[PDB]
């Protein structure tokens, strides 16, 4: 299999008009679980978390949240104190773990004030990188406390990559699929004195794929146009890349995708 | 988050030292805590451990083996005044609090 | 600072009712009611993750909680059992997985 991960965010908002907290987990691209503060209950997003993890799990996650959303208030309330900031404001962490190609692991923990980065963890130096002078003094009373620093390493290093493991299990059938591209060239007079080469890949999941062109199969061009990967709806996704050349040298578009090349020369 | 075993109870002298084993069984862990109990009174925090080596707290020291399930308060220079039950527990994935029965520590002058 | 538990100690009459209470100055968000009985460890009545929510623990039957603020998590007998005749410990804690602090405990004896 290739690359996954699991990733957790909170959203904090004072004063909303929106709920004052959300939380959303995923799996790659998939979200698997929701709470906010209108709900206040931890609900699956995925059809393969309702099946596999009984009652107990949403119930006891339902309590933790309700934990969580208020130490989200309470920390808000404090940074915006911190910074004489006042009327609405956001609070964000985002925590995750990767499980790569190789076995080999990632984990992450970071918050952002009103979608800044404000502090991001080190989990090798166990430390708080601090972009000002509130994160600094945050970072100093999370950096005294030992037992929380040695506690995150090892959620992010063994509970998380378990938990992962755990929804990839869980979920097989949808994320470790492979609908591979449909890719088309089409050479188009766009507009007056342009004449361009498309290459559309669509129906494809998963959502990471490499589009480029190619000049005499050496030489990859500089100056492509590229169209974003984008959800088609459907649990696939659609991608492009273009270039603009004389109208009468062999042009070949290369896409990869979950570990096949794909070649299309005009 | 299952199971949790200490010994009921040790007899030691005082100037000596105890080592009070607790072995654990989980899928899915989020550290091993030790509290004092002294007869009468309320337990209160010794220890925490979740990575895998020992923590020296002056008298006192706490070793984890994750892999081992496997955790032992270490007491040096045992007074009369160690005399209480230590109890043992741990988080299990979803923060359950799982405790030991407890060891009751009888330190002899 | 630290978690006051009343009262120290309380005698009942089979079926009579009572609240134990317990309060904590230090803004932690958990509070739990454990009852504490000869050979076994710990077990948790009923918790709260913080104000506006509580959950059954492992042994909830017979008991009940409000947590309508931060401060307080009292413990209600509904109708006193010999069974229930143990120590009782309210605990509060930072968060789920930060130390315990608690109350100096609640030594109840019910009598038919």
């Known amino acids: 299999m290739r690359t996954h991960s699991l990733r957790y965010f909170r959203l904090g908002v004072s004063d909303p008009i929106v709920p004052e907290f959300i939380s959303v987990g995923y799996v790659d691209s998939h979200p698997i679980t929701t709470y906010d503060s209108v709900t206040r209950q931890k609900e699956p997003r995925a059809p393969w978390m309702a099946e596999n993890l009984a009652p107990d799990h949403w119930e006891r996650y339902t309590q933790l949240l309700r934990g969580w959303q208020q130490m989200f208030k309470v920390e808000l309330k404090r940074l915006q104190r911190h910074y004489n900031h006042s009327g609405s404001h956001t609070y964000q962490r985002m925590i995750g773990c990767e499980l790569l190609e190789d076995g080999s692991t990632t984990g992450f923990l970071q918050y952002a004030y009103d979608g800044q980065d404000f502090l991001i963890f080190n989990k090798d130096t166990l430390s708080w990188l601090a972009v000002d002078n509130v994160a600094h003094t945050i970072k100093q009373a999370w950096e005294a406390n030992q037992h929380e620093l040695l506690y995150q390493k090892n959620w992010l290093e063994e509970e998380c990559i378990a938990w992962l493991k755990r929804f990839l299990e869980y979920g097989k059938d949808t994320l470790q699929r492979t609908e591979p591209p449909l890719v088309r060239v089409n050479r188009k007079e766009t507009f007056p004195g342009v004449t361009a080469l498309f290459c559309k890949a669509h129906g494809f999941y998963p959502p990471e794929i490499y589009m480029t062109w190619m000049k005499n199969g050496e030489e990859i061009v500089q100056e492509i146009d590229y169209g974003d990967i984008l959800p088609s709806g459907d649990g696939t996704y659609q991608a492009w890349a273009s270039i603009e050349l004389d109208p009468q040298n062999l042009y070949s578009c290369h896409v990869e995708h979950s570990g096949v090349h794909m070649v299309l020369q005009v | 988050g299952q199971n949790i075993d200490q010994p009921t109870e040790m007899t030691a002298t005082e100037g000596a030292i105890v080592q009070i084993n607790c072995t654990y069984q989980?899928?899915?862990?989020?550290?091993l805590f030790w509290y004092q109990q002294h007869a009468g009174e309320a337990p209160t925090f010794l220890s925490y451990n979740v990575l895998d080596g020992l923590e020296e707290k002056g008298r006192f020291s706490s070793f984890l083996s994750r892999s081992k399930g496997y955790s032992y308060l270490l007491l040096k220079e045992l007074q009369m005044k160690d005399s209480a039950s230590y109890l043992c527990a741990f988080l299990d994935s979803n923060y359950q609090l799982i405790w030991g029965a407890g060891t009751k520590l009888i330190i002899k002058p | 600072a630290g978690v006051t538990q009343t009262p120290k100690f309380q005698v009942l009459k089979t079926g009579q009712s009572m609240t134990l209470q317990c309060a904590q100055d230090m803004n932690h968000n958990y509070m739990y009611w454990y009852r504490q009985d000869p050979g076994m460890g710990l077990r948790l009545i009923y918790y709260?993750?913080?104000?506006?929510?509580?959950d059954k623990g492992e042994v909830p039957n017979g008991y009940n909680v409000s947590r309508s603020t931060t401060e307080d998590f009292p413990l209600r007998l509904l109708s006193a059992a010999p069974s229930q005749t143990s120590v009782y410990f309210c605990?509060?804690?930072?968060?789920?997985?930060?130390?315990?602090?608690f109350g100096n405990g609640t030594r109840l004896t019910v009598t038919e």
């Open positions: 605990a509060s804690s930072n968060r789920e997985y930060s130390p315990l602090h």
């Open positions: 989980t899928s899915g862990f989020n550290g």
């Open positions: 709260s993750a913080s104000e506006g929510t509580t």
